[PDB]
């Protein structure tokens, strides 16, 4: 019932944001059915435009799009799923901190489709980097759920050059301080990668880089002996990794205070044997052997980091060449497409492409499209539209075309701008006799009651009797007669 | 009466809607609540410091303390912040700063933080060293620890530790940080003041650990407690380091003390390749102007194990030292004019003492370069204080400039036996002796006393005796 509420705007939402709301319900209806599977490819490219266009005002639409979007990915199969994930990476980069209620299912959904060796590896990895930026500090709530998949990537990877691992090392650097209770189990996989000679050189390069870049936001004092020893058996082994390995070691001696002093003889023998002369590392070692100050030795690395931080519708309307029923249907479909194209709102413009390939989603958007364009036009332009609607209603007898126009009249009455002008009193007399032949007596009775409120006449009273009888309310019709016996002249009641 | 007279002062904290006066203006209603909270706090503190109030507020039956602790667990935000301030004052603990991160609130509680009484105008070193170096008492009973032990035991028995844990894991982000520090201080207060028996149901955190190991409970809460223990873990390291020196004057006092108690208890080849690569990287030569040299690479060159200008007689090193000699020279106004608050204030000062020690190693050769520094410091002293006829203009600048970090250069020379002999040749001890009898200079006198090293017998001790017996009374008080 909420969906039907929005189509009429019962909440009196201002027209500025009314258009995005009515667009989503039209797009979601064609999104919850598996029968229209082929249209799913291009509908999402329009949803991702609405979210981008609005910005910070798209949060209230999250409870509608997300539950259906997540279900679709679970059931859909083929090339669509790999494309749906990239779109899902965009809707999490727009709304940042409000994806928390829906993150539990997203993490679970990513578990099944992350097959160890498949083309869907990078788009999963690229999605992770977009999620961690969005959460930005509270990712640790869901980080442990994706570590079991990530753990067996540094030892079971058949990609040439171990590119997948490199594409994953650059994603670990973005975690920063998010991982604090998971470093005891995530670091041994990292240190295992740059000590194995059989690993390709580019893979070992990033393994050393991802440690020093992670040093800037984490404390590695406790994990000293675990990663210092692999370093000293790497300088002697690889003559090509000497330059970039010292940068990781030197960035770690800085965190440790005077506790590293006992490790100098173990390292100095590797430096005198292989003649390693690193400029930055030479500075730190001198400061420890011979004193510099007292408030600097044995300093907490986290405190040090904190200190450093601190107009064309007439041709569509005025045709007059439509005589056949199919032409009347064709004219309506031509009109509906034309309104969406130029509706003075990017939210409705984006839906024009889908309207060409799907007509039924343009019928429910007729009311929303009309109010956008009609408001912009002045008195002279909008007057020409009214007289074309008059000719449109009093020409044919097809129920489908009239029902669309009859519903449009009701939509305008509910709005705060008042009903659309017509010949006489917003055309109640014309609409009243127009819905009678369409077998829609709920509207016909309402229009007659408006006529009665102006001035009662014998013709109006007789018509109200006929309408109620065919609406299965004999007792209501009996009240009309009693009104005429005492509140109207005598001996005038027709025997019929 | 029993439980209604004295416990009335606890009403503003236990009652969420307290109305002290039946008739008052509604305009200052918000201000009235804050006034009541402050006044009630001074009464609760005032009744926990008297023996007749502790036994009356901690009765075995229903008491006010169980109502004060029981209200701490209710998820209220205005009461919780008020009660935490009371708890800090009861134990006389330093209050942290309001923040949402633990690191910021940890750097504001360390015992070695700067205070306003440590400046040169106030007590220079004696005030600072009182709160850093420990008291020479290992057997004298501290009668205030006994008082704090009884209060701490009373709160632990009633259930303060369990109440704090609920606060940590079920409150705002800026309230939990104030409660995490209080738990850390209390645990440290309790492993050094409480006896053995009271320490068996203490350092186990039963409530906290169970929450941080259970996967059934909501995920959000689990890591709040896990991170809380992680945040509380770093608190011990801050207490592990202890207070550390803040001023280089006090720092050099400790360094000479540990050196002389470790010298009585009976590294690289440094080929020319290492120096030449390092000297060209120092930037002192090719850019003959300061603020461009790499000040990190200069200290390493000086206190490098084998390079001392004597073993390695090199023309380049003669050029290197003389270029640095011109910068620190007091006459050449390139270093003296620097403001007190220059951003690299520390690094520049340490290297200066780090350099005068380098020259002293080359006793036979460095004395020629060392002769120049000591001479113009004497000339600078002869003008600053005003001992010789001069306008005494340097008095205005001495305080606000780095010219006061010159006693560090002359004090670090007194440590070595061959440095005190150098001072006699330059005759700077004679200059220091005369300036003791100076009425209007008191800033000058204070600096000299602290800088000089009195470990060995010689001229140093004599000058100290004159200062502490023949000078201005205010100056003598500090000596």
**Contact indicator for B36, B12 with CB cutoff of 8 Å:** yes
* A181 contacts B230? CB cut-off 8 A: yes
A180: contact with B, CB 8 A cutoff: yes
A382, A417, A422, A424: which is closest to A406 by C-alpha?
Answer: A422
A92, A102, A34: which is closest to A67 by C-alpha?
Answer: A102
| Tokens (6 digits) for A50 | 């609405």
Please state, in angstroms and as integers, the Cα–Cα distance from residue B390 to each residue in A89, B379, B384, following that order: 76, 12, 9
Burial of B123 (0-12, 13-18, 19+ CB in 10 A): middle
Please state, in angstroms and as integers, the Cα–Cα distance from residue A202 to each residue in A164, A198, A236, A349, B254, following that order: 11, 12, 18, 48, 50
A304: contact with B, CB 8 A cutoff: no
Considering only CB atoms, which chain A residues are within 8 Å of B103? 302-303, 306
Considering only CB atoms, which chain B residues are within 8 Å of A308? none
3-state helix, strand, coil in chain A (%, to 5): 70, 0, 30
**Contact indicator for A269, B282 with CB cutoff of 8 Å:** no
Count of C-beta atoms within a 10 Å radius of residue A301: 19
Considering only CB atoms, which chain B residues are within 8 Å of A287? 299-300
Considering only CB atoms, which chain A residues are within 8 Å of B300? 282-283, 286-287
| Tokens (6 digits) for A57 | 């005002």
| Tokens (6 digits) for A260 | 């590293």
* CA–CA dist B213, B226 (Å, integer): 8
B295: contact with A, CB 8 A cutoff: no
Helix (H) or strand (E) segment spanning residue A264: helix A264-274
Please state, in angstroms and as integers, the Cα–Cα distance from residue B352 to each residue in B34, B302, B320, B325, B400, following that order: 54, 10, 15, 10, 19
Residue B189 DSSP SS3: helix
* CA–CA dist B196, B181 (Å, integer): 24
Contacts of B421 (CB under 8 A, 6+ apart): none
* A295 contacts B244? CB cut-off 8 A: yes
* CA–CA dist B425, B439 (Å, integer): 28
Residue B339 phi, psi dihedral angles, 5° rounding: -70, 160
| Tokens (6 digits) for B356 | 């005068």
**Contact indicator for A220, A255 with CB cutoff of 8 Å:** yes
Contacts of B159 (CB under 8 A, 6+ apart): B69
In the numeric block, the tokens 């982000």 are attached to B173
B57, B53, B43, B56: which is closest to B12 by C-alpha?
Answer: B43
Considering only CB atoms, which chain A residues are within 8 Å of B254? 294
Q: Of the candidates B244, B245, B303, which has its C-beta nearest A290's C-beta?
A: B303
A140: contact with B, CB 8 A cutoff: yes
Residue A110 DSSP SS3: helix
Quote the minimal CA–CA distance from B103 to chain A in Å.
7
Considering only CB atoms, which chain A residues are within 8 Å of B277? 277
**Contact indicator for A431, A450 with CB cutoff of 8 Å:** no
> Rounded to an integer, what is the distance from CA A363 to the centroid of its chain?
24
* A286 contacts B304? CB cut-off 8 A: yes
| Tokens (6 digits) for B229 | 């223990």
Nearest chain B residue to A285, by CA: B300
Quote the minimal CA–CA distance from A184 to chain B in Å.
13
* CA–CA dist A384, A388 (Å, integer): 7
B217: contact with A, CB 8 A cutoff: no
B301, B285, B303: which is closest to B293 by C-alpha?
Answer: B285
Burial of B66 (0-12, 13-18, 19+ CB in 10 A): middle
Tell me the H-state helices in B385-458: 394-398, 407-411, 417-426, 429-434, 443-451
Nearest chain A residue to B304, by CA: A286
Tell me the H-state helices in B75-159: 78-90, 102-107, 126-130, 143-158
Would residue B313 be called left, alpha or beta, if left means φ above 0 and alpha means ψ between -120 and 50 degrees? beta
Considering only CB atoms, which chain A residues are within 8 Å of B251? 293-295
Residue A242 phi, psi dihedral angles, 5° rounding: -60, -40
Quote the minimal CA–CA distance from A358 to chain B in Å.
45
Q: Of the candidates A140, A290, A300, which has its C-beta nearest B237's C-beta?
A: A300
* CA–CA dist A365, A333 (Å, integer): 12
CA-based radius of gyration for chain A: 36
* CA–CA dist A121, A164 (Å, integer): 8
Beta partners for residue B339, in sequence order? B401
Q: Of the candidates B219, B244, B297, which has its C-beta nearest A294's C-beta?
A: B244
A277: contact with B, CB 8 A cutoff: yes
* CA–CA dist A440, A434 (Å, integer): 9
* B220 contacts A141? CB cut-off 8 A: yes
Helices A242-253 and A225-235: angle between axes, nearest 10 degrees:
150
B271, B298, B293: which is closest to B283 by C-alpha?
Answer: B293
In the numeric block, the tokens 């580019």 are attached to A202
Instruction: Resolution in Å, one decimal, please.
Output: 3.7
Beta partners for residue A116, in sequence order? none
B276: contact with A, CB 8 A cutoff: no
**Mind giving me the DSSP string for A387-407?**
HHHHHHHTT---HHHHHHHHH
What experimental approach yielded this model? cryo-EM
Q: Residue length, chain B?
A: 479
B350: contact with A, CB 8 A cutoff: yes
Quote the minimal CA–CA distance from A114 to chain B in Å.
24
* CA–CA dist A390, A425 (Å, integer): 14
| Tokens (6 digits) for B457 | 């017998």
Quote the minimal CA–CA distance from A31 to chain B in Å.
32
> Rounded to an integer, what is the distance from CA A365 to the centroid of its chain?
20
* A292 contacts B299? CB cut-off 8 A: yes
**Contact indicator for A48, A90 with CB cutoff of 8 Å:** yes
Q: Of the candidates A279, A302, A306, which has its C-beta nearest B281's C-beta?
A: A279
Would residue A9 be called left, alpha or beta, if left means φ above 0 and alpha means ψ between -120 and 50 degrees? left
Contacts of A248 (CB under 8 A, 6+ apart): A208, A209, A211, A212, A231
Considering only CB atoms, which chain B residues are within 8 Å of A107? none
CB hemisphere CA count around A34 (13 angstroms): 7
Please state, in angstroms and as integers, the Cα–Cα distance from residue B346 to each residue in A291, B299, B352, following that order: 14, 13, 10
CB hemisphere CA count around A442 (13 angstroms): 4
Give the torsion sign (CA, A136, A137, A138, A144): positive
Considering only CB atoms, which chain B residues are within 8 Å of A256? none
- Can you say which residues of B are annotated as belonging to the binding site for ATP? 290, 319, 323
Nearest chain B residue to A299, by CA: B241
**Contact indicator for A36, A55 with CB cutoff of 8 Å:** no
Quote the minimal CA–CA distance from B380 to chain A in Å.
27
**Mind giving me the DSSP string for A430-443?**
HHHHHHHTTT-HHH
* CA–CA dist A58, A21 (Å, integer): 10
* CA–CA dist A205, A472 (Å, integer): 84
* CA–CA dist A83, A79 (Å, integer): 7
CB hemisphere CA count around B324 (13 angstroms): 27
Q: Of the candidates A180, A290, A303, which has its C-beta nearest B230's C-beta?
A: A180
Nearest chain A residue to B101, by CA: A306
**Contact indicator for A99, A141 with CB cutoff of 8 Å:** no
* CA–CA dist B9, B38 (Å, integer): 12
* CA–CA dist B403, B396 (Å, integer): 11
Residue B339 DSSP SS3: strand
Residue A370 phi, psi dihedral angles, 5° rounding: -65, -45
Quote the minimal CA–CA distance from B439 to chain A in Å.
35
Tell me the H-state helices in A55-162: 62-75, 79-94, 100-112, 122-135, 147-151
* CA–CA dist B124, A212 (Å, integer): 41
A159, A158, A52: which is closest to A95 by C-alpha?
Answer: A52
Number of A to B CB contacts under 8 A, please give it.
Answer: 67
A303: contact with B, CB 8 A cutoff: yes
Beta partners for residue B401, in sequence order? B339
Long-range CB contacts for residues B167-170, cutoff 8 Å, separation at least 24: B167/B72, B167/B73, B167/B80, B168/B208, B168/B224, B168/B225, B168/B228, B169/B208, B169/B211, B169/B221, B169/B224, B169/B225, B169/B228, B170/B75, B170/B221
| Tokens (6 digits) for A28 | 């979601």
Count of C-beta atoms within a 10 Å radius of residue A278: 17
Question: Which letter, b or e, does each residue of A430-455 get, where b requires 16 or more Cβ atoms within 10 Å of its Cβ?
Answer: bbbebbbebebbebbbebbeebeeee
CB hemisphere CA count around B335 (13 angstroms): 22
B133: contact with A, CB 8 A cutoff: no
* CA–CA dist A270, A241 (Å, integer): 14
* CA–CA dist B275, A127 (Å, integer): 51
| Tokens (6 digits) for B176 | 């939990």
**Mind giving me the DSSP string for B296-316?**
HHHHHHHT-SS--SSSS--HH
B281: contact with A, CB 8 A cutoff: yes
A181: contact with B, CB 8 A cutoff: yes
* CA–CA dist B294, B290 (Å, integer): 9
B414, B324, B309: which is closest to B367 by C-alpha?
Answer: B309
Count of C-beta atoms within a 10 Å radius of residue B28: 11
Burial of B180 (0-12, 13-18, 19+ CB in 10 A): buried
Nearest chain B residue to A291, by CA: B255
* A268 contacts B299? CB cut-off 8 A: no
* B234 contacts A294? CB cut-off 8 A: no
Quote the minimal CA–CA distance from A285 to chain B in Å.
9
* B297 contacts A294? CB cut-off 8 A: no
């Amino acid at each position: 019932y909420s969906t039907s509420e929005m189509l009429v705007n019962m909440g009196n939402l201002p027209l500025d944001e009314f258009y995005p709301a009515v667009s989503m319900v039209a797009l979601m209806r064609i999104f919850r059915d598996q029968s229209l599977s082929h249209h799913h490819t291009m509908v999402v490219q329009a949803i991702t435009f609405i979210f981008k266009s609005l910005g910070l005002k798209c949060v209230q639409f999250l409870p509608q799009v997300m539950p259906t979007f997540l279900n679709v990915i679970r059931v859909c199969d083929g090339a669509i799923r790999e494309f749906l994930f990239q779109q899902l990476g965009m809707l999490v980069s727009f709304v940042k901190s409000h994806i928390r209620p829906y993150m539990d299912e997203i993490v679970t959904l990513m578990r099944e489709f992350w097959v160890m060796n498949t083309s869907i590896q990078s788009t999963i990895i690229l999605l992770i980097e977009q999620i961690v930026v969005a959460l930005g500090g509270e990712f640790k709530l869901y980080l442990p759920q994706l570590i079991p998949h990530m753990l067996r990537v540094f030892m079971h990877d058949n990609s040439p050059g171990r590119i997948v691992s490199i594409k994953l090392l650059a994603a670990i650097q973005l975690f920063g301080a998010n991982l604090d209770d998971y470093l005891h189990l995530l670091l041994p996989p990292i240190v295992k990668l740059f000590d194995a000679p059989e690993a390709p050189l580019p893979s070992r390069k990033a393994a050393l880089e991802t440690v020093d870049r992670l040093t800037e936001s984490l404390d590695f004092t406790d994990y000293a002996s675990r990663i210092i020893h692999p370093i000293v058996r790497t300088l002697d082994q690889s003559p090509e990794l000497r330059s970039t390995a010292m940068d990781t070691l030197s960035s770690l001696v800085f965190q440790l205070g005077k506790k590293y002093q006992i490790f100098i003889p173990m390292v100095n023998k590797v430096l005198v044997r292989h003649r390693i002369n690193h400029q930055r590392y030479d500075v730190l070692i001198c400061r420890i052997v011979k004193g510099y100050t007292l408030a600097d030795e044995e300093e907490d690395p986290l405190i040090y980091q904190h200190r450093m931080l601190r107009i064309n519708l007439q041709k569509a309307w005025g045709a007059a060449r439509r005589v056949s029923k199919d032409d009347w249907l064709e004219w309506l479909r031509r009109l509906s497409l034309e309104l969406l194209k130029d509706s003075s709102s990017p939210s409705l413009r984006s839906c024009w492409a889908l309207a060409q390939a799907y007509n039924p989603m343009a019928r429910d958007l007729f009311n929303a499209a009309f109010v956008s364009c009609w408001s912009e036009l002045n008195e002279d332009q909008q007057d020409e539209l009214i007289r074309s609607i008059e000719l449109a209603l009093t020409s044919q007898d097809i129920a489908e075309v009239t029902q669309t126009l009859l519903n449009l009249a009701e939509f305008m009455e509910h709005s705060d701008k008042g009903p659309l002008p017509l010949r006489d009193d917003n055309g109640i007399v014309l609409l009243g006799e127009r819905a009678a032949k369409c077998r829609a007596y709920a509207k016909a009775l309402h229009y007659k009651e408006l006529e009665f409120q102006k001035g009662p006449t014998p013709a109006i009273l007789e018509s109200l009797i006929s309408i109620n009888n065919k609406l299965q309310q004999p007792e209501a019709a009996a009240g009309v007669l009693e009104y005429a016996m005492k509140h109207f002249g005598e001996l005038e009641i027709q025997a019929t | 009466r029993a439980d209604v007279e004295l416990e009335r002062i606890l009403a503003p904290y236990t009652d969420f809607h307290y109305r002290h006066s039946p008739d008052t203006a509604e305009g200052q209603l918000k201000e009235d609540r804050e006034a009541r909270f402050l006044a009630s706090k001074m009464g609760i503190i005032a009744t926990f410091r008297s023996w007749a109030g502790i036994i009356n507020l901690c009765k075995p039956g229903n008491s006010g303390i169980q109502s004060l602790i029981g209200v701490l667990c209710i998820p209220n935000m205005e009461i919780r912040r008020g009660l935490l301030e009371v708890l800090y004052d009861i134990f006389r603990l330093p209050l942290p700063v309001v923040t949402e991160e633990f690191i910021e609130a940890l750097l504001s509680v360390d015992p070695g933080r700067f205070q306003d009484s440590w400046r040169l105008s106030d007590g220079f070193v004696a005030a600072e060293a009182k709160t850093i170096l420990p008291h020479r008492a290992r057997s004298r009973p501290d009668l205030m620890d006994n008082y704090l032990a009884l209060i701490l035991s009373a709160f632990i028995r009633n259930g303060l530790l369990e109440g704090l844990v609920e606060v940590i894991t079920n409150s705002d982000d800026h309230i939990s940080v104030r409660a995490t520090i209080l738990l850390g201080e209390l645990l440290h207060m309790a492993n050094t003041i409480l006896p053995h028996s009271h320490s068996h149901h203490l350092h186990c955190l039963p409530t906290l650990m169970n929450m941080a190991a259970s996967f059934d409970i909501p995920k959000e809460k689990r890591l709040r407690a896990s991170a809380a223990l992680n945040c509380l873990k770093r608190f011990h390291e801050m207490k592990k380091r202890g207070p550390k020196p803040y001023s280089l004057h006090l720092d050099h006092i400790i360094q000479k003390a540990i050196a002389t108690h470790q010298k009585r208890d009976q590294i690289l080849k440094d080929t020319e390749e290492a120096l030449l690569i390092n000297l060209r990287d120092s930037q002192v030569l090719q850019h003959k102007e300061n603020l461009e040299w790499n000040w990190n690479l200069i200290g390493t060159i000086l206190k490098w194990p084998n390079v001392n200008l004597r073993n390695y007689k090199d023309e380049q090193l003669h050029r290197f030292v003389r270029r640095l000699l011109y910068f620190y020279k007091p006459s050449s106004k390139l270093y003296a004019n620097l403001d007190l608050d220059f951003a690299k204030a520390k690094q520049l000062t340490v290297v200066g003492c780090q350099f005068t020690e380098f020259l002293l190693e080359s006793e036979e050769d460095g004395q020629g370069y060392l002769e120049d520094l000591v001479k113009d410091i004497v000339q600078w002293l002869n003008a600053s204080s005003g001992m010789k006829p001069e306008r005494s203009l340097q008095n205005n600048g001495l305080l606000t400039t780095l010219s006061q970090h010159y006693f560090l250069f002359i004090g670090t020379l007194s440590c070595h036996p061959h440095g005190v002999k150098m001072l006699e040749k330059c005759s700077v001890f004679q200059c220091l002796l005369n300036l003791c009898s100076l009425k209007n200079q008191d800033h000058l006198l204070k600096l000299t006393v602290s800088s000089l090293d009195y470990s060995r017998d010689g001229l140093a001790r004599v000058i100290l005796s004159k200062i502490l017996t023949a000078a201005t009374d205010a100056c003598r008080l500090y000596a």
